Each structure stands twice: as C-alpha cells, then as structure tokens.
Design a protein around this ligand. Structure first.
Ligand SMILES: Cc1cc2nc3c(=O)[nH]c(=O)nc-3n(C[C@H](O)[C@H](O)[C@H](O)COP(=O)(O)OP(=O)(O)OC[C@H]3O[C@@H](n4cnc5c(N)ncnc54)[C@H](O)[C@@H]3O)c2cc1C
Ligand code: SF4
Ligand code: SF4
Ligand code: SF4
Ligand code: SF4
Ligand code: FES
Ligand SMILES: [Fe+3]
Ligand SMILES: [Fe+3]
Lengths: 291, 437, 252, 437
C-alpha cells in the first residue's frame, strides 16, 4: 500500500492501454474503462455495469445499465457534462436482477457508491451487490448548457459534427468528424463550471477499485491506479490474460510528478473554497458536508 | 434643363444607361434608368417546351441569382400542376436559397465599396490594390463567397445553375457527411458575415456623415435625402418566398399589371450636356438622340398601378417595419440580411433527414390552370407565373426584381447630382440581365 | 425626525416594491411625514447602498453572483433594522426551485433566503406581501424609533411575532401546516390557510387542510396567516384601538 | 475611444448596467446595455413540473407584469394540449390584461418624469416633493394605478400574481355586483387616463423642443435623432395576443432564433473614463474590466436573424403604421395606449356573462406536441413555448419583451451623449427581471 495524501491509497500505478484494437478506435484515452468492464463481464466478475451511454441530445450522456460487450462499448469517450450514473444503482439489483453490479463514473460518483455501501439509506441490497468500480480522473464538470456554450460559441463548432472533446494543455479541444480542430482557453470556460465541483477534494477517484485517467501518460495511454483487493484481483488476471500493455509509471513522462501536482492544485483550491463557506455570510456561513 | 447621359453604367450586373434631365446646378430633375440589354425572350421561347426544361433555361437568365429563377420557375410549375413536394426537398431548397443570398450580398459589397470611403479619411476603397485594409477585406469577402458557393453546390447540385432542383423536389438528398460539411461551413460563415456586416455598416454610417464625395476629381455634394422616392415597397417573405399553393399566399396577383416602358419613361430627347472626364471614358456625345420609351428593354410591372421598390429594404420594411428610406437605407438593410442566412442554413440542416424522400410520389401533368411562385431573390421579389398542360408550358411570365426596380430607381434619381446618379443605382444592386430576361 | 428607509432588490420580482406602492396615498403620507427613501434603484438614482434605519430587502441571494453576496452583507452592515420583505427574502419562495443550467449564466444555480447569509430582524412574509402589512411595519418601525414610551411599547409588541418568525427559520411551505399545526394538535379547521394561499393549493376536506404540494410555490403565507401559528392576544385583542392608531397616523 | 460604465442603472425594473465606448466628445460610438440580474432559471426548473404549477412560478418572474407571464404560460400549456377555454374565461382574461397595462404604463410615468421638464421651464419633475404641479400629478397616477390593481384583483383573483387563471380558463366567474364595480371603476379610470395621457404627451412634446437637458449640473445636448435604430419592430396584437391555437397566428416561430450574448455583445474592455459626479454616486472606477458577452445574463432572441424592438411603439407601428422612431416616439406611443385599456374593459364587461362557464369541460393531458402563446405585455411581445405530455412540462422556453429589447436598445445608444444613455434606456420601460427570468 501507498498512502499518498493527494493521490489516495493504492497498491501500484502503471501506464496502460488496452490491447483490444476495436475498443481503442473510439476510446478517449487508453480504453481502460471500457476494457476493464468488458473483461469483467466476460470473466463473470460482473453481470452488468452502469456506463455513460448515448443520450437524447448530441454529446449529452445518459446513464444506462449495460449487460453486453456491445452496450459497454457504446459508452466510450468523455462527455464533459453531468451524467447521473448513480440513479440506476439500486435498480440494477431489482428489475435487472443483477448479482454483481459494476459502476463507472467520476470521483464523486465513486464516493456515492462507497457511502451507499457503508450507510445504505433506502439502498437495500446495494452494499453487498456492488462488485467492481472504475473511477475516472476528474478536475471539474459542466452543465449541458455550459457545454453547448463552450462548443458552439467559443469553439464555433456544430455539436453534430464533433467526434471528440479533450481538456488538456490548458485548452478545451474540439475535434470534428471531417478532420478539423478547435481550441478554447480554459480561462474562458471557468464561468461555466458546475458550482458543486468547487468543493470536491478528490482528483484521481480515490475511492474506486481501479482509477484511470489521462494526465501523466502520453496520448493513447492512461494512468491507472490499482487500489483495492477487488481491483488487484481483476487487474492481475486481465494483464495475465493479455488484455493490457503496461509500463511502470516512473518510466513515463510526464508521469506521477505532474499528476501529483495537479491533484494538489485541485484539493488546495477547493479546500480553500470549502473554508470560505464557513464565513460566507455576516455572523453565519454555508453548510460543509465534510464537517 | 439640360440632358446628360451615362452609357454604359458600371459596377452592376449587365447593360444599362442613365438618361438624365438636370437643372442649371447639375441636379437631376427627371432621370430615366433603363435596360439596353438585348431581350433574349425567355417568356416567349418557353411556350411549348417541357415543364422540366423551362426552369433550367430560366436559370440561365442570370448567373449571380440562378437559384432565384431555378426555384421560382420550378415552383411555378409545381403550383400550376398541383404538386406538393416532400419536406426534405423543401429544406434543401431553403439551404440553397440562403447560401446564394450570402454569396450575392457579398459580391455586391465588391461592387459598391469603390464608391465608399475608409471611415474618417478621404481615401476610397480600392479592392484591387494589395494594401490594407482593402486586402484583408477582400480576403474575408472571398472566403464568405467560397463558403456560400460550396453549400450551394452541395445542396443544389451546382453553385451556378443548380442541377438538383426538379419538378416535384430534388434529384438527390445529401449524405450524412455532406450535412456535416454544410454545417461546419455555415458555422465558419456566420462569424465571417457578422464581421463583414459590422464592417459594412460602419462604412455606410461614415458615408451618411459625409457632406461630399469626389467623382472624377471634383467634389460632389451628398444630399441628405439621396435616393428618396414615394413608391413604397413590395415583398413576399423575409427569407424564402410564397406560391399559389399556399393556404394564405403573401403576393396578390390581382394587384399586379405590367405595361410597356411607354407609360412611365420619357420620350425622345437630345443630349446637350457632355462631360468627357466622367471616369473613365466620359458621357454620351452632345447631339446624340435618346428615347427611353423605345430604347428601354424591359416591361414595367406595377403594384396598385404604380412602380414599387423590391429587395432587402422592401423585405425589412414589409416584415419588420424598417423605417429608413433611400440610398444608404437600402445599403444598410442589405447588410442586415447577412446573419439570417447562416442561422437559417443551420436550422434547416438540423431538421433535414438525409434518409428522407426528396421527390413527390406523383407528379401531375397539369390541365392548363394558372399557378405562380415568388422567390425572394437577393435583389427582391422574383415572381414566375405559368400554365402547364400535358407536361408542357402553355403560358409563362417573369416579373423579376430589377424589372420592378427600374422605374422606381428612376424616380429616386430626382435630387441627385447627376455625377452620383450611379450611386443611387448601385444601392438597388441591379441585375439588368435579370431585369430583361 | 423622519427615519431613513431603503428598498434593496436582491433576486426578487419587484412585486414586493409594487405592494409597498399599492398603499397609494398612504405611501406618500409616510414619505411626507415619517420617512425618507434614501435608496431604491427602481425609483431613485442613489447608486450605492447608504446607511438606513430600515432596509426593506426583497428577493433571495444567488450564491454564485459576487455582487449579490456583497450587496446583502453590505446591507446588514449599513442598516439598524433589516426586514426580509416578502416570501423570497424570508423563505426562498420560487427560487428554492432554481437549479441552474439556463443561459446566459448556467452556473447561477443556488439561491438562499437572506436570513441564511445575514441576521434578519423582521419577516414580512407573503407572495405577494399585503400592502397593509408593509405599511403597518413601516409605521410601527417609526413609532419604535421616534415615539413616546407608550408608542415604542406598542410597536415592540406589534413587531414581536414578525421578529419571532425571523428567528424561527428560513423555510416556508404547505407542510408548515402539517409539521407545526395539525401534527401539533393545534388545527381547529378555521380555513384561513386556504384563503391566504396565493395559488389555491389548499382545500379543506372534512374541516382539515389538504395541500397540493406540487402547486405550492413555498411562500410560507399559510402558516403565517394561520391563527394557530402565532396568536399574540395582547395585540390582537386590542384590534379596534390598534386600528384607530394606525388610521390616525395616516390621516390628513 | 474611451470606455465609461454606469452600474447600476436606475428608474427601471431590476439590475442592469451600461458599458459604453465613447468618442472624444463623449458621444456613444458603440454601447452595450446588459442584464446583470442573476438567472433564476425558470425555463430549466420548469421541466418535469406540472402544467398547473409552471404558470404560477412563471408569474413570479416579475411583479409589475405577472399577468403577462401567468397568461402567456397558461395559454402555452393550453396550446400544447389543445384546450379551448370558454368565452367568459377569455373575457375575464382580457379585462385582467387591459387593467394591468394601465397600472404598468402609469408606474412607468413615475420612473421617467424625473428626467422630464415642467413645460416651458428649467425645472424637472420631483414627484417625491409635496409641491405643485408634482403632487396633483402623483395623486392622479396613484388613483389610476389603484383602479387598475382593483380591477385586476377582481377579474384575476390577485393584482400581483393573479390566482384566477388556470389551465382551461378561470377558477371563478365574478358576481353581478363585481361586474358593476369593474364598470364603475373603468368609467372613472377612463377620464383619468385621458387627462394623464394629455399631460404626458405635452411633457414629451416640450422635451422634443428642448436643445439640452441638465445632468449632474452640466448641460447635455439633446440629439434630434436620440435613440434611433434600424432594427424595426415586432408585435402580435394591439391589445391581447395570439397563440398557436389560432386559425391565423400573428407570430411566426420559424422566423425566431435565440443566441447567447456572444453574437451581439462586445467582448472584454477596460474602463478608462470615470465620472464621480454622475448622480448619485458616480460611474464604474477606472481600471475595472468588463465583458458584456460573458457578463450579460440574458439570451438574445432574434427575428429574421436580427434583434427587434417590441412594446407600445412596436404595436402601433405594426398595427397602425405609426411612423416615428426613437426615444421620444417610444414615450409617445406608450401614452397613446391609455384609452384602449379602458374602452376594452368596458366592452368586455358588456359582453361578459356572469353566469357563464369559465372552465373547459375537458382538459387534455397532452402528448408532447409543441404549443406557444404570445401575450402583448405592457413592454411588448411575451412568447412562451411548451411541450406538455401527461400533464407535465417536458420543454419550456420564454422570449420576454425586455429580452428582445436589450440588444436593440444597445444599438439605439449610438449617437447619444453617454450622460443621457439612461434616457434612451428608460424609453424601453425595461424589466430586467423579466428579461432574465
Ligand atoms: C467531467 C470529466 C472530467 C474529466 N477530467 C479529467 C482530468 O482532469 N484529467 C484526466 O486525466 N482525466 C479526466 N477525465 C477522464 C478522461 O477524460 C477519460 O474519461 C478517462 O481517461 C477514461 O478514458 P478511457 O479510454 O479509459 O475510457 P473509454 O473507454 O473511452 O470509456 C469512457 C468511460 O468514461 C465514462 N464516461 C464518459 N463520460 C462520462 C461522464 N460525464 N460522467 C461519468 N462517466 C463518463 C463512461 O461510462 C465509460 O466508462 C475526465 C472525465 C470526465 C467525464
Ligand atoms: S470535480 Fe468532483 S464533484 Fe465535479 S464532476 Fe468531477 S468528481 Fe464530481
Ligand atoms: S415574495 Fe413574491 S412578489 Fe415579493 S419578490 Fe418574491 S416573487 Fe416577487
Ligand atoms: S389556518 Fe385554520 S384550518 Fe388552516 S392549519 Fe391553521 S387552524 Fe388549521
Ligand atoms: S400551500 Fe400556498 S400559502 Fe402555503 S406555502 Fe404553499 S403556496 Fe404558500
Ligand atoms: S417541505 Fe413541503 S413539499
Ligand atoms: Fe417579364
Ligand atoms: Fe428565455
């Protein structure tokens, strides 16, 4: 175990990408989140998983319980607006009849799952049926109207043409299907962030079985934390089964040094906000969920 | 009274001249702007031809606005035979229409800017010259028109003389890729036309604050009411048009009548005032006889018994009660039409089903009933009227925007220094091949 | 000496100000004799919040709007008596339902009644608030600050239930009638709540309140008006005398 | 060019500011008037709520014009579900509507008169002051608004946030006594509004003959074309409104599109011109950064791709071809609307059957179809659009008059001395809480 104060508790950290070439075609990064859920399904570690499927408007995610490789793959790619993944967490154990639920999502959604496992409040059967969680790194998120405003105005792109979006190197990047690229400085995007993200003290999905993201690894590759016993069993067996290319993270640029720094900026900035809440008013303050 | 004549006019489409009676100060008392473009006679040669051919011939009336004649002619045939085209065909036609309006208004920027001043200076725009700001402006205009023609080619089959329109809808729907491409281009175009529009409005506003302009070395005073006329306006839509298939058509054929130039133009005059220094090549020689009634090549359509103004200003006055008139008001209203074109294209692409039908399942052959269609061409209401029987055109008539504007502009010439009569003319964005057909 | 009164407009609809103005010549009488309007963006050109004896504050506070948060803090600093005027200021009202996501400020997501950010001396609940109540509070505030001791005693007794409401909390709903009246063994079936509800969300079934909770806009009126919320017998039993006193103060 | 900023504006409803680029004489070159009112987000919070609740929430957008939102929202729901309300419900709604227009126009008299002069003098109206003529004028205005609110309360259940409107008509018809009371009050009100109207028109006419006004001690010249813009106007009725249930609706949703402030507002600027003597409290400090594109809280609805003016002048221009424009023309047109309100109330009372039905026998629950309703609020066209399915709002959109007027007024600021930009603004009778919702 490593007990990093900004990267959470983990056993190891590698740089990885799926060896499944079909998965990689539309994966955001290394295809880790898709590849792990597909593999867990084929191996019987899960019988279904909650993923950010395609929704009713372009680039709007819709949470869905996926129970086939095909349905899991439909959720490839980052949607930078809210996907209420946990809304299907109980239902997966009811009408879907699952015994071994997988869950994908960002840090706060990983938090929601663990709170439900330990303090189930009208969440019967959920603590014992969560089987496998994969958490994405997340700096901040946006409402759908925010995402529309950023892509359509600031990047000047039609949503119906966008093939990929990416926040990296200080910019919001928009890639179109016909091959064009547009960028927006992140300074322009700040007004649009979901306000509840400003109180979030978790960057690399500390509470997931396995955590995965982009920062620290080259393009096409993911930085992966293997954290829990569940996480280590599944990762070991998938590596052994040929499912991933890996590199120790210390042999990779920018690697864990850049990552630990961005994690620190996130927590530091948000801890400050958390603190300003206490004296937000005159002789009174706002609620602190962490108190 | 003296008579001065400018022949030919320039920086407009096609071939016309100005035959002007002026007072002792050189101010127009009564001026006639008239077509002297040969009459190719599209209305008469159409008789007996197939309803499929006639719109493709009518297209070749004009290569700046062939969309206008292609659509107005096709939809006149559809109105005569009672053919209702599919939704996705209509959406593709509107995309074609809006794109062509962009390219046309931007081409007209090229023609009128040489008369205009770099704001706050005494320098006029020379768009040929590889200097700033002209070259940066030319680059924007050129990209705008390129985008416009590209969209027109994709949705209409061809930018000049679109091939996709046919009786009953379109030959082709577009691919998912093509739909993305048109959207990508419209997004780029919208930013550019917003920039060009603000640029042009500033240039125009500078013109309205000037007191004189320089023509051929001389200072020419700028009247405050330059280009004012009392004919009012006519328009059938802010964007697309109307046809006799509509539940409530927005054009009234009982209010229309067309005369010869006879009723509205001057008879024989003799030129007794000549200026060899008029740039570049002078005016008509003293002693030349002119006869606008006999030399005008157009008919004169009227509405409620009088000439009317058509075009962008007519549209904004009819549909938003735009309340400025004359030369610079016409220029302003034209620029204001830039963004609607891109928003319309984007909305139409959004609703377009690329798997949808584009050709009516049944195309009737007609029984000789009259139908009509109005297309709001970039220069104004383009109204085609037809009787189709057994698939053949038995009767055809074309009331084209510049045809309408010829007698109206003429009356608007009163009060102008004859040396800027051409500026009054160019605010109408004339298409004399259109006007004459 | 006239007291100094401001109208502070937070995230409100200005209907609270309209209600004040709907005292008609009563308002002009008050402005003539008892009070100077030192601040009100709707009616006067004073651009910044000055000192006030009474701040009539309408609307709630958007947490994601910096100027708004500064305004409500500045208001408490500048004012002797802070009045939450109307249900948005008291209880959040329709801004309880705000949840962001609309152009051109999709982050404008969170709204709180003013009592969650500053200390509030007096509630005037209602949506819209009754003109008569706003008038009574203005007149009594004056008497509390410029009267003889007999007047300042009356004024203090009159305002007490409205000050108690400010100390009770910042929430208003049809449920108040359940939580604090029916569930407390206090409802006697008078039907007043039904008359006060601005959206007809309350009916009485066999003499007992029935709330259409998905019609209720959370204004807190019904509990306020209920004669088993506060019933201060010392004031209300003197209704004839207190009415005559208020009338005389508005007379010409 | 320098940048001066007035924040906040005053003597209008709600919270906005003016960010102004000015020439070396202090004349606006390009000005942005923008909402900085927090977005309560009524359109998004409506989704999933019941069609009965949403109009009562929308009412609380604004307490000066809650009738506008109550009626437009209710009638949008009725249009989506296909519910035809009874005649006597419609008559009561029109009475409610007309009464509220009286109170609103009279409240606006209070806000604008401090900028105006007692005719023939250099004294401005101070309506607070217990002196003549101000006090006599205040007494008339106060009685006018009292009558108006009383009628509104009787026909609408409540003057502010009317309670009587419901999906399918009204909760209550009125008694024979109530009908007599409303008539008695309208008779009294008609005489008063005729007096107030003639008073206001005289004050305005005196303003048009002035050459300067005094702001903060200084003489500010009054341009002849103060407040002129080239956006034209939009209006759906002279009195009540229109909805997609009508046989011939008078608003065209295919001509509408809403953008972010992005397309129409200035980006980042820095304030480099400050006047601490601007009454009362000065202007924004030098060095302050502003960004209208990002700070504006509204969307920008457009008609034919351009901002439009809505409101009384828009109504008279659309329906009577009223042909004056700008600041004082807007003031004039607003006053001219006083008598129609009282004549309408009296005619509606005359036709009202107090024993008539007020609730449709059947209220459908909707299938997700889109409906829309336009209410001609005192400040202009208020258009609500909705999809109701199973009694719940699945989609909601609000295009409110001051939302429309924000970009249009901005453009109208050109040519004004920045010290009277607020006078240009107040002729629009702005409701910024309305505009933002
Ligand atoms: C708001 C958001 C912010 C992020 N910020 C960062 C960051 O700052 N640094 C960094 O390194 N990585 C960040 N990521 C993660 C990164 O963008 C990729 O999502 C991650 O690397 C997974 O890529 P992959 O190839 O392994 O997954 P893929 O194989 O492409 O599969 C996509 C996975 O992402 C899930 N998913 C996609 N969109 C959402 C969504 N809105 N909400 C919940 N789950 C979703 C899907 O269920 C699926 O599990 C962010 C992701 C999101 C949604
Ligand atoms: S920053 Fe935190 S609260 Fe916001 S979406 Fe990401 S993990 Fe959730
Ligand atoms: S309490 Fe009601 S009337 Fe007062 S600001 Fe809030 S919505 Fe308006
Ligand atoms: S107002 Fe009357 S009926 Fe309503 S809760 Fe109070 S005591 Fe019960
Ligand atoms: S039930 Fe009616 S009075 Fe009571 S809080 Fe709800 S809306 Fe207000
Ligand atoms: S807390 Fe009332 S639903
Ligand atoms: Fe012809
Ligand atoms: Fe809106």
């Amino acid at each position: 175990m490593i007990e990093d104060p900004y990267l959470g508790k983990y056993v190891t950290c590698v740089s990885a990408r799926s060896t499944d070439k079909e998965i990689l075609k539309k994966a955001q990064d290394g295809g880790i989140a898709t590849a792990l859920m597909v593999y867990a399904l084929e191996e019987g570690f899960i019988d279904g998983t909650i993923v950010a499927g395609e929704g009713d408007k372009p680039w709007q995610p819709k949470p869905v319980v996926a129970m086939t490789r095909e349905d899991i793959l439909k959720a490839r790619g980052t949607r930078y607006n809210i996907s209420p993944q946990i809304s299907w967490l109980k239902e997966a154990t009811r009408s879907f009849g699952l015994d071994k639920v997988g869950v994908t999502g960002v840090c706060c959604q990983m938090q929601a799952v663990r709170k439900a496992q330990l303090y189930p409040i009208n969440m019967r059967d959920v603590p014992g049926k969560v089987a496998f969680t994969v958490g994405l790194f997340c700096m901040e998120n946006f409402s759908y109207k925010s995402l529309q405003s950023i892509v359509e105005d600031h990047a000047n792109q039609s949503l119906g043409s966008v093939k990929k979006m990416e926040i990296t190197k200080g910019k919001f990047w928009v890639y179109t299907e016909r091959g064009n690229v547009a960028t927006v400085p992140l300074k322009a995007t700040h007004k649009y962030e979901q306000p509840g993200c400003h109180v979030c003290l978790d960057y690399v999905s500390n509470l997931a079985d396995i955590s995965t993201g982009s920062v620290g690894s080259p393009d096409g590759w993911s930085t992966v934390f293997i954290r829990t016993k569940v996480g280590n069993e599944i990762w070991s067996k998938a590596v052994a089964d040929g499912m991933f290319e890996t590199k120790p993270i210390e042999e990779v640029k920018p690697g864990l040094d850049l990552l630990r720094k961005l994690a620190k900026q996130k927590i530091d900035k948000n801890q400050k906000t958390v603190e300003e809440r206490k004296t937000f008013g005159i002789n009174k303050g706002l609620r602190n969920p962490y108190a | 009274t003296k008579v001065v004549e400018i022949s030919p006019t320039t920086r407009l489409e096609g071939h016309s001249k100005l035959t002007l009676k002026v007072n002792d100060q050189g101010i127009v008392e009564r001026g006639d702007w008239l077509s002297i473009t040969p009459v190719r006679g599209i209305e008469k040669l159409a008789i007996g031809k197939t309803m499929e051919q006639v719109p493709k011939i009518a297209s070749r009336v004009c290569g700046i606005c062939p969309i206008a004649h292609t659509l107005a002619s096709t939809e006149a045939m559809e109105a005569s035979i009672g053919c209702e085209i599919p939704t996705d065909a209509k959406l593709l036609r509107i995309i074609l229409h809006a794109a062509n309006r962009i390219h046309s208004h931007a081409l007209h920027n090229i023609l009128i800017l040489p008369d205009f001043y770099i704001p706050g200076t005494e320098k006029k725009f020379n768009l040929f010259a590889n200097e700033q700001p002209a070259r940066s402006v030319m680059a924007r205009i050129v990209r705008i028109r390129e985008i416009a023609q590209t969209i027109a080619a994709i949705a209409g089959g061809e930018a000049i003389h679109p091939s996709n329109p046919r009786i009953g809808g379109m030959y082709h729907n577009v691919s998912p890729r093509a739909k993305q491409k048109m959207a990508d281009l419209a997004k780029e175009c919208l930013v550019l036309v917003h920039e060009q529009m603000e640029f042009m409005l500033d240039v125009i506003r500078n013109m309205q604050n000037r007191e004189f302009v320089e023509v051929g070395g001389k200072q020419i005073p700028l009247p405050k009411k330059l280009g004012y006329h009392n004919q009012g306006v006519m328009a059938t839509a802010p964007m697309y048009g109307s046809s006799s298939l509509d539940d409530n058509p927005t054009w009234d054929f009982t209010r229309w009548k067309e005369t010869r130039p006879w009723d509205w133009y001057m008879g024989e005059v003799t030129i007794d005032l000549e200026d060899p220094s008029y740039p570049i090549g002078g005016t008509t020689k003293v002693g030349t006889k002119a006869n606008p009634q006999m030399e005008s090549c157009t008919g004169v359509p009227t509405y409620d018994g009088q000439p009317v103004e058509v075009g962008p200003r007519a549209r904004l006055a009819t549909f938003k009660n735009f309340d400025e008139k004359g030369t610079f008001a016409q220029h302003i209203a034209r620029q204001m039409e830039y963004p609607d074109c891109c928003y319309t294209i984007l909305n139409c692409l959004d609703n377009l089903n690329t798997s949808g039908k584009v050709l009516a399942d049944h195309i009737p052959q007609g029984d000789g009933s009259m139908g009509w269609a109005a297309n709001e061409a970039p220069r104004g209401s383009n109204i085609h009227l037809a009787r189709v029987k057994d698939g053949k055109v038995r009767w055809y008539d074309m009331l084209v925007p510049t045809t309408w504007n010829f007698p109206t502009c003429s009356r608007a010439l009163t009060g102008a220094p004859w040396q800027i009569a051409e500026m009054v003319v160019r605010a109408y964005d004339p298409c004399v091949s259109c006007a004459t057909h | 000496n006239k007291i100094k009164i401001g109208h502070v407009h937070m995230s409100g609809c200005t209907g609270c100000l309209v209600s004040l103005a709907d005292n008609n010549l009563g308002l002009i009488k008050i402005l003539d004799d008892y009070a100077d309007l030192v601040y009100c963006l709707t009616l006067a050109d004073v651009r910044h919040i000055p000192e006030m004896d009474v701040a009539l504050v309408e609307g709630s506070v958007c947490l994601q709007d910096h100027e708004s948060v500064e305004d409500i803090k500045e208001t408490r600093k500048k004012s002797k008596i802070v009045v939450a005027l109307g249900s948005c200021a008291c209880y959040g009202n329709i801004t309880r339902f705000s949840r962001g996501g609309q152009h051109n400020q999709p982050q404008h997501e969170s709204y709180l009644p003013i009592g969650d950010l500053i200390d509030v001396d007096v509630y005037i609940p209602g949506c819209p608030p009754s003109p008569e109540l706003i008038r009574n509070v203005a007149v009594m505030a004056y008497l509390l600050l410029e009267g003889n001791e007999e007047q300042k005693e009356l004024a203090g007794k009159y305002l007490k239930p409205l000050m108690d409401l400010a100390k009770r909390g910042t929430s208003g709903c049809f449920c108040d009638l359940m939580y604090d009246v029916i569930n407390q063994g206090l409802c006697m079936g008078c039907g007043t709540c039904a008359a006060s509800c601005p959206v007809h969300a309350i009916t009485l079934e066999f003499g007992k309140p029935q709330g259409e909770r998905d019609l209720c806009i959370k204004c807190g009126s019904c509990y306020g008006a209920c004669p088993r919320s506060f019933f201060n017998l010392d004031v209300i039993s003197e209704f004839e005398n207190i009415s005559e006193i208020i009338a005389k103060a508005l007379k010409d």
